[PDB]
Amino acid sequence: TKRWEGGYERTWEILKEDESGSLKATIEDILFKAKRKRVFEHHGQVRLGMMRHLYVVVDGSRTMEDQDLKPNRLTCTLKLLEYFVEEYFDQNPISQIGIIVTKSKRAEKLTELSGNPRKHITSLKKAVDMTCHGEPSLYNSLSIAMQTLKHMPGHTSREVLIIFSSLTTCDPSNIYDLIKTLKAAKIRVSVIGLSAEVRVCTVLARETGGTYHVILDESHYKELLTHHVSPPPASSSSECSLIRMGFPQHTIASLSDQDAKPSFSMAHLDGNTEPGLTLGGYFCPQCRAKYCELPVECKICGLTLVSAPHLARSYHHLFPLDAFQEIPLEEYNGERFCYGCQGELKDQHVYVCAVCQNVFCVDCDVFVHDSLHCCPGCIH
């Protein structure tokens, strides 16, 4: 039988009257039921992650001049890559991005593997005006990525993302041997095609554990990149995976004190123009080297300079707040004022924390579970 060939639904039978006017009570119940439309979690997916050393390979062949994506594939690809780099560094604190451009059967390492987003964005903007010629070489790009990532620590997840526009690749040697070597090296390879499905990309993605997708339009391209942003699930505990990193305090210099010492920034020292000789900035806790941008690994002593708030922003996932016990107002024989907003409790349901047994209204409960991520009573 069919669902719609039976009896027609009467959704208006829910409302009923006993005292001629209880519709106000019904609409109050409906308004209360309208709230709490979430699961008390902003993400609700992967609550953790792992250090990812991701390499992004961009096709630089003549096929990038095609106008499937306005204005051409290269410009849309680089714009979406800038967006992807920004989002990936936003959602991954201690990750690194490398960019490889393959052209004329050779692969050029456009950018070193590091955690600076500004350098990658500047490199992409510079590469916007590149010359699209020749044919891509997946073998050379994968060889460069494997050579770079072979010496990386085992606990980090090694990933390669390939943007393959051209349907043909030139390999100076057998590629399936390289795929076997990558599989033995536990390097994940993901490919996002632009024209159509290529067998070698499917085999590579299946064997290395990655995913192979083909772009339908620019929105689908952005969706695939956004999916690639998310970190992979992390095993319980592998080994002593740790890392020596510093937390450079942003100590600026004021001439009101006698210790106002101007210093050139190491990052700005490599620029053609005059480096910024500002009063202060981020001083390395180990060698007192000065940097302006974070997170940037120290050039001198090799220490990783990260920002503590960036690491702390993900701490609420480790310790989620347990849902408060929903209690009807009549059954709660205690105070009738919310502990968070001091407002009078007039809702039919009152939420009580399991730890401190305090009183929270619906709005304060939603705010605590969604945004605050901490019980105000438990803090005291």
Binding site: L167, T168, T169, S195, A196, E197, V198, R199, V214, L216
Partner: protein, 677 residues
């Protein structure tokens, strides 16, 4: 699961049944209940065999008396092995779903070379000598002399099979050819002889077309096996061609030289009955008279015997006795081997054919050769003209002969090409979650000039440039494999020469590798191997071949192999050599078949047969193009199989190269997304 047909339940290994399979089962059950022949057309090479075998087994279980013997004649040995393994899988499914065995036997039949255990004959590559060596090793005289136990090397598998293998039967257990060989070698028996003994006590059996189309072996292999039996010819789109070739023989200088060389040896052996000893001597000069005659053609199917009875003045009666003399005089002469002896047998076969079959045949002498026409080469061939003769002895001996293939679009021409009484007129078009093929016809090029491969325009530079441009900018959109079929080798080489002359073949090379299929078997095989290895990785490849070649049907382009199939012009058979025109005249004055209609039917049959090999499996998908404006006309589109007609929308019937490329890009982009089951 158990599929509930209108009057029976049939077990099927696969739980899900496509609507095409269900309708096919309905039609086949209707035909079996109708006790008549039929013709079927399905688009899937795989999944048809399992359904056919399942319905056959269900019908045998329900009606053991109505159906007793099943024949599954196919084209080659890979089809035999795949249908045998599918039958084995079906039997395993039945055993695991029922729990008790059944007394059903299924065996595969092939030549002596396929089924032999002696290591002294396997390494050699002479298919015409293996049978002779097998006969020499074991025969009636060998059996007679084995009583005295003569000390001489001979085959001994039969000498054990006749005393031990003729009593123990094999009621249950279907055996493949390798299984038959293993049983023969473990029991010391010949696989061929045990197959000959066990075909009588068997349920199903599979072999090639030649064991039923050729009268010289059909009687030996099938004489009184079963009065009421079911036979099916899967992949029989070219049944007429093989039927014609069944009664076609050729003669050349080498054949007559071999005959005159071996007649002296025969006479020397004889001088160490008389009705043929002097009969065979003077037959050579009558046919060598045509060697010295410098004439274009002589045709006299009824008057050939009249002319024979004048130069040598021989009666017609002794000619028909050659067939019965072959099995008698040769075994008494104790021929050591059939090497240097086959032309003598083929001369007797030709004499018997011309003496008996003279109503629908024609004799043609062709003094022409490729690249060396007139040096010394009067070629005499007894070309058959009617396809009904090779199919008569099976329609009257069977009840439900079924003709099925992937290309049987016109069901009104096969019943009149060969004497047939169809009662089905049934076709089936596959359905999937998405359209797995994108057929389209490309007419004029970017210059709005037709790319028709017309004879007057074959040498035109504009059409060659348009073909090259189509192959170039098509090779940049379809990845990992393109198969292009040309009308003929001469046109193919002349087009690639022009492409090389211009700076256009380099642009095709830098996209995909170019591989050219030639007449050499080893070169073709190695080219196919390197094409496959280039398609495996991302390099891509192009397979340039001919529609009427051994590679068009010898291989199947499964998914990721040949995503696009390109037809450069309508493949029309050569009207020269005065062989096709004789058949055209015979069909014109006998079956009232229009010459243009038959030529278009043959062209479209070949085009569809070579373009439908890119879709093997539900998940497989492929691009199909037709690079000729003549395809756009309705009289040729209507000859395409129904599973391609509905996917060929009227939007793309004359679109140029650019719009064809755009359609291909959209199709390939939309076919790469994940789907469901």
């Amino acid at each position: 699961m158990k599929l509930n047909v209108d009057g029976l339940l049939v077990y099927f290994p696969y739980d899900y049944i496509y609507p095409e399979q269900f309708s096919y089962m309905r039609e086949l059950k209707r035909t079996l209940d109708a006790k008549g022949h039929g013709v079927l057309e399905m688009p899937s090479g795989t999944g048809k065999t399992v359904s056919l075998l399942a319905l056959i087994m269900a019908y045998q279980r329900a009606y053991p008396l109505e159906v007793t013997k099943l024949i599954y004649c196919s084209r080659t040995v890979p089809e035999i092995e795949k249908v045998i393994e599918e039958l084995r899988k079906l039997l395993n499914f039945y055993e695991k779903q029922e729990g008790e065995k059944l007394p059903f036997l299924g065996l595969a039949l092939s030549s002596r070379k396929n089924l032999c255990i002696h290591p002294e004959v396997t390494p050699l590559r002479f298919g015409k000598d293996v049978d002779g060596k097998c006969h020499s090793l074991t025969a009636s005289y060998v059996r007679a002399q084995y009583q005295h136990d003569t000390s001489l090397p001979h085959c001994r598998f039969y000498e054990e099979f006749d005393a031990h293998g003729r009593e123990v039967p094999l009621p249950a257990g279907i055996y493949n050819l390798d299984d038959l060989k293993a049983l023969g070698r473990r029991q010391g028996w010949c696989p061929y002889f045990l197959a000959r003994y066990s075909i009588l006590h068997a349920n199903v059996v599979v072999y090639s077309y030649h064991y039923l189309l050729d009268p010289k072996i059909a009687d030996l292999v099938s004489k009184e096996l079963a009065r009421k039996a079911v036979v099916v010819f899967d992949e029989a789109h070219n049944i007429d061609n093989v039927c014609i070739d069944s009664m076609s023989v050729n003669l050349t200088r080498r054949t007559l030289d071999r005959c005159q060389g071996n007649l002296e040896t025969l006479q020397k052996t004889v001088l160490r009955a008389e009705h043929f000893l002097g009969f065979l001597r003077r037959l050579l000069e009558y046919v060598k008279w045509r060697l010295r005659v410098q004439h274009v053609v002589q045709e006299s199917p009824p008057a050939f015997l009249s002319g024979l009875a004048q130069r040598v003045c021989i009666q017609r009666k002794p000619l028909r006795f050659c067939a019965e003399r072959l099995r008698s005089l040769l075994h008494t002469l104790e021929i050591t081997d059939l090497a240097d002896f086959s032309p003598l047998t083929l001369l007797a076969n030709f004499a018997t054919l011309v003496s008996t079959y003279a109503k629908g045949f024609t004799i043609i002498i062709e003094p022409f050769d490729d690249r060396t026409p007139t040096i010394a080469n009067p070629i005499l061939h007894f070309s058959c003209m009617d396809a009904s003769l090779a199919i008569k002895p099976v329609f009257e001996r069977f009840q439900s002969v079924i003709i099925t293939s992937g290309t049987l679009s016109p069901l009104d021409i096969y019943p009149k090409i060969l004497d047939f009484h169809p009662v089905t007129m049934a076709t089936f078009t596959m359905t999937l979650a998405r359209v797995c093929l994108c057929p389209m016809i490309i007419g004029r090029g970017n210059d709005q000039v037709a790319i028709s491969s017309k004879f007057e325009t074959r040498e035109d530079i504009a059409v060659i440039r348009n073909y090259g441009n189509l192959l170039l900018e098509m090779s940049a959109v379809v990845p990992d494999g393109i198969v292009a079929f040309f009308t003929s080798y001469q046109y193919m080489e002349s087009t690639v020469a022009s492409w090389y002359e211009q700076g256009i073949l380099e642009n095709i090379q830098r996209n995909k590798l170019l591989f050219i299929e030639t007449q050499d078997g080893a070169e073709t095989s190695v080219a196919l191997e390197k094409y496959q290895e280039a398609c495996e990785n991302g390099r891509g490849a192009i397979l340039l071949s001919v529609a009427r070649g051994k590679v068009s049907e010898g291989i199947d382009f499964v998914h990721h192999y040949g995503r696009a199939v390109i037809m450069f012009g309508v493949p029309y058979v050569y009207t020269q050599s005065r062989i096709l025109k004789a058949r055209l005249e015979y069909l014109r004055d006998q079956f009232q078949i229009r010459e243009n209609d038959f030529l278009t039917f043959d062209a479209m049959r070949h085009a569809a047969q070579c373009v439908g090999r890119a879709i093997r499996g539900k998940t497989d998908y492929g691009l199909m193009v037709f690079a000729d404006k003549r395809f756009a006309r309705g009289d040729k589109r209507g000859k395409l199989p129904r599973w391609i007609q509905e996917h060929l929308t009227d939007a793309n019937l004359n679109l140029t190269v650019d719009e064809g490329v755009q359609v291909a890009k959209y199709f390939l982009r939309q076919m790469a997304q994940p789907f469901h089951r």
